[PDB]
JSON list of C-alpha atoms and ligand atoms in Angstrom, two decimals:
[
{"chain": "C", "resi": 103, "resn": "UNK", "atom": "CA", "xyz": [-11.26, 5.63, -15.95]},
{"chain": "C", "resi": 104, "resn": "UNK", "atom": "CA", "xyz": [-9.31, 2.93, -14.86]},
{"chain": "C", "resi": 105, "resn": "UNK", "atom": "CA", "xyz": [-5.64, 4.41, -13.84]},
{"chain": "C", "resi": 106, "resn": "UNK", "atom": "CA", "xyz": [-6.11, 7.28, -11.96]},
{"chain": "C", "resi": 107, "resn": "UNK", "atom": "CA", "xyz": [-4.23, 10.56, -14.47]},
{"chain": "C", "resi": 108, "resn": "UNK", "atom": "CA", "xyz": [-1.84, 12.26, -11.52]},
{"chain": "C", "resi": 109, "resn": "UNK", "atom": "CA", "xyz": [0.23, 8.67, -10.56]},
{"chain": "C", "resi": 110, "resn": "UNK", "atom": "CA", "xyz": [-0.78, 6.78, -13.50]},
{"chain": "C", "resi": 111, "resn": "UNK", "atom": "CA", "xyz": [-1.89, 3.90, -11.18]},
{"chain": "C", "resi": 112, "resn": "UNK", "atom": "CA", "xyz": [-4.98, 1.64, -11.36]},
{"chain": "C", "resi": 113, "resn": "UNK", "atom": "CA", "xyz": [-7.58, 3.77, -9.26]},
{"chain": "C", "resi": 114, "resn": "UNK", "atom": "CA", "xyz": [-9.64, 2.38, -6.21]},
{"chain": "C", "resi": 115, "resn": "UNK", "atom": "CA", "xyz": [-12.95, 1.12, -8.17]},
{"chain": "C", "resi": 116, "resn": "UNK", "atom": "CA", "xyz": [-10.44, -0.66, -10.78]},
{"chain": "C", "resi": 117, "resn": "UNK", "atom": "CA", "xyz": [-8.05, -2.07, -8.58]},
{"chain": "C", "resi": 118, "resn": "UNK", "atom": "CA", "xyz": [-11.56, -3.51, -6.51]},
{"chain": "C", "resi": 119, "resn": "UNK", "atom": "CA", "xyz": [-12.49, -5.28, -9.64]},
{"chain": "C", "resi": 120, "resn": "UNK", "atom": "CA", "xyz": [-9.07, -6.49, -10.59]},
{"chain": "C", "resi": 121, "resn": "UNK", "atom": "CA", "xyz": [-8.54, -7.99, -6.92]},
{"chain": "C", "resi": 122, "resn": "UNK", "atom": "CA", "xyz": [-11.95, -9.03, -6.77]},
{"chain": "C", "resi": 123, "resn": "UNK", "atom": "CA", "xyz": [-11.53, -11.53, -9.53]},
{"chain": "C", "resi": 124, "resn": "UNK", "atom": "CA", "xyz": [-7.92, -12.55, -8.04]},
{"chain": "C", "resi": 125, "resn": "UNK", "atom": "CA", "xyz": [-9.77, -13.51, -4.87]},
{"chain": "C", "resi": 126, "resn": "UNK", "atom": "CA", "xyz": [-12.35, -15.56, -6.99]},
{"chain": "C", "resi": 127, "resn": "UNK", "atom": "CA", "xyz": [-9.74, -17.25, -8.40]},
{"chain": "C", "resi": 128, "resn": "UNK", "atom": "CA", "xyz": [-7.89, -18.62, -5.42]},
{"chain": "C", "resi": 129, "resn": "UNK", "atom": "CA", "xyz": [-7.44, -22.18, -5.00]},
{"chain": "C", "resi": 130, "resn": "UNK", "atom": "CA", "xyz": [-7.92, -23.67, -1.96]},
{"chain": "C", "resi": 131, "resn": "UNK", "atom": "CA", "xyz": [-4.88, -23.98, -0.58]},
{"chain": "C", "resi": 132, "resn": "UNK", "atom": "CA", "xyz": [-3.10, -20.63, -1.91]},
{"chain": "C", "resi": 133, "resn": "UNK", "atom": "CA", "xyz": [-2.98, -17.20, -1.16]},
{"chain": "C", "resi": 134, "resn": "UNK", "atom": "CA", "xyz": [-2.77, -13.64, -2.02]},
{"chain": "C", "resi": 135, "resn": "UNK", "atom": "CA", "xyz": [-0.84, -10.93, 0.03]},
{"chain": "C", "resi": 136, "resn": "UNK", "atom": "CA", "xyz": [-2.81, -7.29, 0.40]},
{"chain": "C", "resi": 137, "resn": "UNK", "atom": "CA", "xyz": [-1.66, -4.65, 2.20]},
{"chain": "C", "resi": 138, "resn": "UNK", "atom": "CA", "xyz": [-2.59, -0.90, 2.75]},
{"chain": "C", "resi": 139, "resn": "UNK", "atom": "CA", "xyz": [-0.01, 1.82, 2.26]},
{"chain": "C", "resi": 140, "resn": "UNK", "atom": "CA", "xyz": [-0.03, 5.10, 4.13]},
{"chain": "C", "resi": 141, "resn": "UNK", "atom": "CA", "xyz": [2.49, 8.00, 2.60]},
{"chain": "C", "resi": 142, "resn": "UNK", "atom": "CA", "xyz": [3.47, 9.32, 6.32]},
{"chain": "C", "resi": 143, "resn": "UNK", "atom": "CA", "xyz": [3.31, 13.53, 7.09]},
{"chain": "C", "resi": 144, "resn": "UNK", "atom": "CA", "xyz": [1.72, 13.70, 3.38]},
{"chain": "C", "resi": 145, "resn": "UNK", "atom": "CA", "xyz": [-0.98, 16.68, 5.02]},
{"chain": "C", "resi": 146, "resn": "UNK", "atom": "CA", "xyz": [1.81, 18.66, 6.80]},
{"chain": "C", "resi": 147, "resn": "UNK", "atom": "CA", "xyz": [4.00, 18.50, 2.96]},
{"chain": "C", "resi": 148, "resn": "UNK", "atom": "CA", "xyz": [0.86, 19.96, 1.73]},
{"chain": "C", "resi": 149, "resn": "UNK", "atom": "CA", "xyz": [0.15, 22.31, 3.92]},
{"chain": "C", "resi": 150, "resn": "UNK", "atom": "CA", "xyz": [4.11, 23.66, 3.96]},
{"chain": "C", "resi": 151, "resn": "UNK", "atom": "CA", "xyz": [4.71, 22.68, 0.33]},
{"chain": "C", "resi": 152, "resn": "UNK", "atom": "CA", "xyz": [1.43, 23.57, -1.69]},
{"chain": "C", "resi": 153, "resn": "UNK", "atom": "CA", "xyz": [-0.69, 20.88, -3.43]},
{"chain": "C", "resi": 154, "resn": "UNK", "atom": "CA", "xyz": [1.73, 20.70, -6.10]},
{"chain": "C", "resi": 155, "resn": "UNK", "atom": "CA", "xyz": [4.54, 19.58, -4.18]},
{"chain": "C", "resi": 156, "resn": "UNK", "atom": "CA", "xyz": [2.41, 17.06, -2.73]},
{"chain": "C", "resi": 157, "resn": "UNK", "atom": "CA", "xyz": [1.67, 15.83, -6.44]},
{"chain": "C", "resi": 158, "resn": "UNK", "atom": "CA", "xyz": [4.89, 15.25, -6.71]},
{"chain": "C", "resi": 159, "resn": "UNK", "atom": "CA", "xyz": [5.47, 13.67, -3.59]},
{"chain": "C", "resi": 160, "resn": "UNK", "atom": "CA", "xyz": [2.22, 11.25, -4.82]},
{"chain": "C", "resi": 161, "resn": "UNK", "atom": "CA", "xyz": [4.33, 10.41, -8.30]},
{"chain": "C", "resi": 162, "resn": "UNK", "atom": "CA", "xyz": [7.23, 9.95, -6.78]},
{"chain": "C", "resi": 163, "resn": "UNK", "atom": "CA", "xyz": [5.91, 7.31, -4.33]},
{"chain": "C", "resi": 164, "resn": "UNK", "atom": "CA", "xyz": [4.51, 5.83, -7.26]},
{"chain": "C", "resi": 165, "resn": "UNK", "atom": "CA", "xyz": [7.52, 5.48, -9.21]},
{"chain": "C", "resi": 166, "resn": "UNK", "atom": "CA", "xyz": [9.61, 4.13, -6.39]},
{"chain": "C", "resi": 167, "resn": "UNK", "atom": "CA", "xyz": [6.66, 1.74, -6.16]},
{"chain": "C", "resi": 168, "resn": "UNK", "atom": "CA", "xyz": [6.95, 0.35, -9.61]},
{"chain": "C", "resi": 169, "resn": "UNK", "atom": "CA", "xyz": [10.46, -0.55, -9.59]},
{"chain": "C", "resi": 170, "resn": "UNK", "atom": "CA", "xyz": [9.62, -2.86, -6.79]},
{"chain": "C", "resi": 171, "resn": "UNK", "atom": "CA", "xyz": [6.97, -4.85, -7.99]},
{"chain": "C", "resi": 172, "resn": "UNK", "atom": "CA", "xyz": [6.84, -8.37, -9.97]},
{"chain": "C", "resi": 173, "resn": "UNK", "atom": "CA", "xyz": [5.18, -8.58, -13.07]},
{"chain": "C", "resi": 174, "resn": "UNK", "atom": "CA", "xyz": [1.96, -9.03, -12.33]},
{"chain": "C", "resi": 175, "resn": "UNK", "atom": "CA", "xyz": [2.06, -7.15, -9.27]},
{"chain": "C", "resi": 176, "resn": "UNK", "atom": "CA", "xyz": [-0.92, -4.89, -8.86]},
{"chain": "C", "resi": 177, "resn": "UNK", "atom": "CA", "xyz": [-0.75, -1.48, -6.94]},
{"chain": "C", "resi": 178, "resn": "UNK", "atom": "CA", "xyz": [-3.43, 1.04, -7.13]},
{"chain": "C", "resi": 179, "resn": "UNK", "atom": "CA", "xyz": [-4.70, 4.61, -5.13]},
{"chain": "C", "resi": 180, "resn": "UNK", "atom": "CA", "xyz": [-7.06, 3.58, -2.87]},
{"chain": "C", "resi": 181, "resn": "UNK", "atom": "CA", "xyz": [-7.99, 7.72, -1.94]},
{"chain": "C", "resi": 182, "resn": "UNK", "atom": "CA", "xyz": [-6.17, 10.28, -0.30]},
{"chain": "C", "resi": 183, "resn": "UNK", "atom": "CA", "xyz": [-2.40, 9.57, 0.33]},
{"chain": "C", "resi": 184, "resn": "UNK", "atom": "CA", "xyz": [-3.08, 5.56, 0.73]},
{"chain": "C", "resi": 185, "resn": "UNK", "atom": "CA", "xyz": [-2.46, 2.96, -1.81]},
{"chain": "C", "resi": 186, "resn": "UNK", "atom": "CA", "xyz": [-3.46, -0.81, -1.69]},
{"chain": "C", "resi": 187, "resn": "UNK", "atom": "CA", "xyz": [-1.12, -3.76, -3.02]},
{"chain": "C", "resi": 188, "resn": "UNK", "atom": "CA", "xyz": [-2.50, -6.78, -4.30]},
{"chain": "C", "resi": 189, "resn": "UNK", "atom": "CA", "xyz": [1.03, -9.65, -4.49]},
{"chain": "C", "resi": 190, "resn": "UNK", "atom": "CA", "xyz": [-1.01, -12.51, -6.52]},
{"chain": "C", "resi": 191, "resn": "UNK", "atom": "CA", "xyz": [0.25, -16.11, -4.69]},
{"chain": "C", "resi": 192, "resn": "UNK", "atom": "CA", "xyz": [2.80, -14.09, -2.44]},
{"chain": "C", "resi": 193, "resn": "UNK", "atom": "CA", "xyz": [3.05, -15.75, 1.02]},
{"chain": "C", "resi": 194, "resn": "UNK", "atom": "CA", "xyz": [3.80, -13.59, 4.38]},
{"chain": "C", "resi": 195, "resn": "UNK", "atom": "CA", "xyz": [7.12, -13.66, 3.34]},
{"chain": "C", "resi": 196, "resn": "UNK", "atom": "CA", "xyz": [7.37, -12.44, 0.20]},
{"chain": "C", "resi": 197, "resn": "UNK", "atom": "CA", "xyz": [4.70, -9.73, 1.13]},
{"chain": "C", "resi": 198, "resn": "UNK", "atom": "CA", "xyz": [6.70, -8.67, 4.05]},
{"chain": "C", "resi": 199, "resn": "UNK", "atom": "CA", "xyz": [9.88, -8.50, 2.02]},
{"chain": "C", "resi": 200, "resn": "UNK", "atom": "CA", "xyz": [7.88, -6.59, -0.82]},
{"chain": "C", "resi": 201, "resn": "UNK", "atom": "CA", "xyz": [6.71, -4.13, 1.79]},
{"chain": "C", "resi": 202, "resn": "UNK", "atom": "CA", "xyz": [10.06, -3.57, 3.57]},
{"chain": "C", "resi": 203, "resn": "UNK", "atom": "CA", "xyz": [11.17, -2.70, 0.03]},
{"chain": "C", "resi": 204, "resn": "UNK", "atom": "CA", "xyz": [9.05, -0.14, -0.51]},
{"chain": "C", "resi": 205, "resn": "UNK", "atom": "CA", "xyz": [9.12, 1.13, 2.86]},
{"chain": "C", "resi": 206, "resn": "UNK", "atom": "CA", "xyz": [13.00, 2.02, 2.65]},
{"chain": "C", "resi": 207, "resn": "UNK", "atom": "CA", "xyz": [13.15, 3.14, -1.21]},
{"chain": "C", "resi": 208, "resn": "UNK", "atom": "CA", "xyz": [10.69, 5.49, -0.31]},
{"chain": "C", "resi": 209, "resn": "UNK", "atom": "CA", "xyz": [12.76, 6.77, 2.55]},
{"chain": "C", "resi": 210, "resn": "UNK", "atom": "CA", "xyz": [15.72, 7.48, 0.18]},
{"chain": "C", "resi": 211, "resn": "UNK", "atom": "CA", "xyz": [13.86, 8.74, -2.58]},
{"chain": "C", "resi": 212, "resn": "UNK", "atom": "CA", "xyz": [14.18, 12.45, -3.50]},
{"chain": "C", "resi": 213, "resn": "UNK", "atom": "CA", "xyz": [11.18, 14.46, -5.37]},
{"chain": "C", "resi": 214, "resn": "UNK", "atom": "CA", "xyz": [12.21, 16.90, -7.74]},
{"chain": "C", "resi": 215, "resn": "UNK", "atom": "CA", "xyz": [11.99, 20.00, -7.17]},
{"chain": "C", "resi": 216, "resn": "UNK", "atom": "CA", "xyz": [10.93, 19.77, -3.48]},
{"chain": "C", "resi": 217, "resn": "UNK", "atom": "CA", "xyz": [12.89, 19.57, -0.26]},
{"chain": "C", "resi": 218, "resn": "UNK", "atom": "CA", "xyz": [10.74, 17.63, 2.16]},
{"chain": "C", "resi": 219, "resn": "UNK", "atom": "CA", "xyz": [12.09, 16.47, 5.62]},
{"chain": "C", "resi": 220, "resn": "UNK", "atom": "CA", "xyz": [11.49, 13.26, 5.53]},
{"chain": "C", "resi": 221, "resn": "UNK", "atom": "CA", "xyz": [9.69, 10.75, 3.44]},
{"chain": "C", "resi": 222, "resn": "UNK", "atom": "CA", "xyz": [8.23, 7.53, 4.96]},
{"chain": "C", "resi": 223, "resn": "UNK", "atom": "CA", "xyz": [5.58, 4.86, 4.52]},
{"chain": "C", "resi": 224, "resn": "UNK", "atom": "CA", "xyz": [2.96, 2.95, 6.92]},
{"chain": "C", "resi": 225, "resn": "UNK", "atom": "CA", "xyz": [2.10, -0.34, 5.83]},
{"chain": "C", "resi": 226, "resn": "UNK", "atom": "CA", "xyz": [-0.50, -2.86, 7.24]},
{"chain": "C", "resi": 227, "resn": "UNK", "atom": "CA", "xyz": [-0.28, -6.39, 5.56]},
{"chain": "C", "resi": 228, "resn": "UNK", "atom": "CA", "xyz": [-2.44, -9.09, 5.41]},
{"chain": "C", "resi": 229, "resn": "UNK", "atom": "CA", "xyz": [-2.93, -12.23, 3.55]},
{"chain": "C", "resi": 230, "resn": "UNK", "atom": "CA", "xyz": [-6.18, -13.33, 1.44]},
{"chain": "C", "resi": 231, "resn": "UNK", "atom": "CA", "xyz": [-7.49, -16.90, 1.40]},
{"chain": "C", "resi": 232, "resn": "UNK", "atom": "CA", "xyz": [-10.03, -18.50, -0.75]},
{"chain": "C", "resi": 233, "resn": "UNK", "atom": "CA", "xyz": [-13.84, -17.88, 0.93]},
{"chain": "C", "resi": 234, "resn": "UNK", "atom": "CA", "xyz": [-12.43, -14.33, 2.28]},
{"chain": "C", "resi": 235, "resn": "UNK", "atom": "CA", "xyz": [-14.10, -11.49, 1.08]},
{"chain": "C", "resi": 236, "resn": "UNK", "atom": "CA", "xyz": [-12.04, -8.78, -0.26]},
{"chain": "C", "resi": 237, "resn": "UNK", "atom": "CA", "xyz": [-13.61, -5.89, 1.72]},
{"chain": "C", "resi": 238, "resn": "UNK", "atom": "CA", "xyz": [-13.37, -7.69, 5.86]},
{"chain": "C", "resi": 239, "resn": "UNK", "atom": "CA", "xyz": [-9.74, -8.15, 4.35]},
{"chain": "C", "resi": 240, "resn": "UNK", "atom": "CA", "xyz": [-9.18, -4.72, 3.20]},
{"chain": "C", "resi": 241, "resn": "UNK", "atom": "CA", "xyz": [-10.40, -4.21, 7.07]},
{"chain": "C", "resi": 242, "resn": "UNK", "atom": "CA", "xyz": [-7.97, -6.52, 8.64]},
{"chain": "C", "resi": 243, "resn": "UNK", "atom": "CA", "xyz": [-5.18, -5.23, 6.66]},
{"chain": "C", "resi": 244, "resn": "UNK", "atom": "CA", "xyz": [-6.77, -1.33, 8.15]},
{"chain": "C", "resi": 245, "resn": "UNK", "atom": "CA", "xyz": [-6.20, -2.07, 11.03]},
{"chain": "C", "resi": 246, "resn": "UNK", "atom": "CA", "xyz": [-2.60, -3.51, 10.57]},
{"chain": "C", "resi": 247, "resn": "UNK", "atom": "CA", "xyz": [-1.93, 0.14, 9.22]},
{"chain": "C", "resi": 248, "resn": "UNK", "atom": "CA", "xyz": [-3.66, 1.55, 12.07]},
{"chain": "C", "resi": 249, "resn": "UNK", "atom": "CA", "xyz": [-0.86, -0.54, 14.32]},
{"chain": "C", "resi": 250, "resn": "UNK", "atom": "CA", "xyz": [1.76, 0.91, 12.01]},
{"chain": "C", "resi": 251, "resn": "UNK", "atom": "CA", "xyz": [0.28, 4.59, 12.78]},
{"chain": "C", "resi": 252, "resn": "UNK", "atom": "CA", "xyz": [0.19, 4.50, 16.21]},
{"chain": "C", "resi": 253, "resn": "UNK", "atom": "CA", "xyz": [3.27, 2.65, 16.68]},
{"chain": "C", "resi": 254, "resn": "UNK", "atom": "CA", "xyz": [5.49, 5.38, 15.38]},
{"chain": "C", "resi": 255, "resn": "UNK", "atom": "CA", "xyz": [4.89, 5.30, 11.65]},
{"chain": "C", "resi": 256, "resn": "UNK", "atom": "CA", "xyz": [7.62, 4.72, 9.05]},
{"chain": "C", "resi": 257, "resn": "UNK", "atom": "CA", "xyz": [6.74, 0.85, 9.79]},
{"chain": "C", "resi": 258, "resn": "UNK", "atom": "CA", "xyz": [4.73, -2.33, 8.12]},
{"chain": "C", "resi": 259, "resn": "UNK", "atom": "CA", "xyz": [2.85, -4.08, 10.59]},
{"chain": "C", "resi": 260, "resn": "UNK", "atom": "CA", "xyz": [0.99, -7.32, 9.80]},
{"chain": "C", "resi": 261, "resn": "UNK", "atom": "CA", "xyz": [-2.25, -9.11, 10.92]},
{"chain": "C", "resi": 262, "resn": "UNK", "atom": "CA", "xyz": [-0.25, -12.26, 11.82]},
{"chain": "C", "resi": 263, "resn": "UNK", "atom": "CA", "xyz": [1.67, -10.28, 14.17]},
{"chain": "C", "resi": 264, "resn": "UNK", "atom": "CA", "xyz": [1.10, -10.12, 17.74]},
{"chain": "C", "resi": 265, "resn": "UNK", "atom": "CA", "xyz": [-0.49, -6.92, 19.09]},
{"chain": "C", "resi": 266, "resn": "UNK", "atom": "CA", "xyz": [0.29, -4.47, 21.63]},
{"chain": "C", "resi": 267, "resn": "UNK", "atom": "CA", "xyz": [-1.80, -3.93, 24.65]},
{"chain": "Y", "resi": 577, "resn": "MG", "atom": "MG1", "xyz": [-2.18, 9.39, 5.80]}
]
């Protein structure tokens, strides 16, 4: 009820009440990195694959995920192929490093029993400051990923970025 079974990550409604309290917690002067996590091509692996191969492609995202994380490092589903990251007291930096990370492990990583194309990862980043509200930063960091999406995928874009136009 509060992992989800197929990844054995926190799922969405847990992770909301784990971050939610996080963001309560902030002291005025600190921050929390948060950042949305699209597994790229994940429909067209399922649709050549079968859903089991995209299983598989889902637990082996979240094992590559794991080994990059600090304790205390929270990373949860968030529904469909997208996953959100909660970095307690990480700054831009440290996010942005954190995200890189993931974004080329999961490029190198090899399912079993499946031979996918490629793998890659979208990833929109934002930070969280005391008096934000967790769900107009979930937003922010959407639309980060949206950036990420349309600029090509396989890419972390951030909200304290400058944007194309
Ligand atoms: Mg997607």
């Amino acid at each position: 009820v509060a992992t989800d079974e197929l990844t054995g990550l926190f799922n969405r409604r847990h992770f909301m009440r784990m971050a939610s309290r996080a963001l309560e917690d902030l002291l005025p002067n600190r921050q929390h990195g948060l950042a949305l996590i699209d597994l790229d091509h994940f429909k067209r692996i399922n649709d050549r694959h079968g859903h089991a191969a995209g299983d598989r492609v889902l637990q082996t995202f979240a094992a590559v995920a794991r080994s990059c994380l600090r304790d205390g490092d929270v990373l949860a589903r968030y529904g469909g192929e997208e996953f959100v990251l909660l970095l307690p007291h990480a700054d831009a930096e440290q996010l942005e490093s954190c995200c890189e990370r993931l974004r080329l492990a999961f490029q190198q990583a090899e399912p079993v029993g499946v031979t996918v194309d490629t793998l890659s990862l979208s990833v929109g980043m934002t930070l969280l400051y005391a008096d934000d509200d967790l769900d107009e930063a979930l937003q922010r960091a959407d639309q980060a990923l949206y950036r990420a999406k349309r600029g090509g995928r396989n890419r972390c874009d951030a909200t304290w970025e400058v944007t194309s136009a």
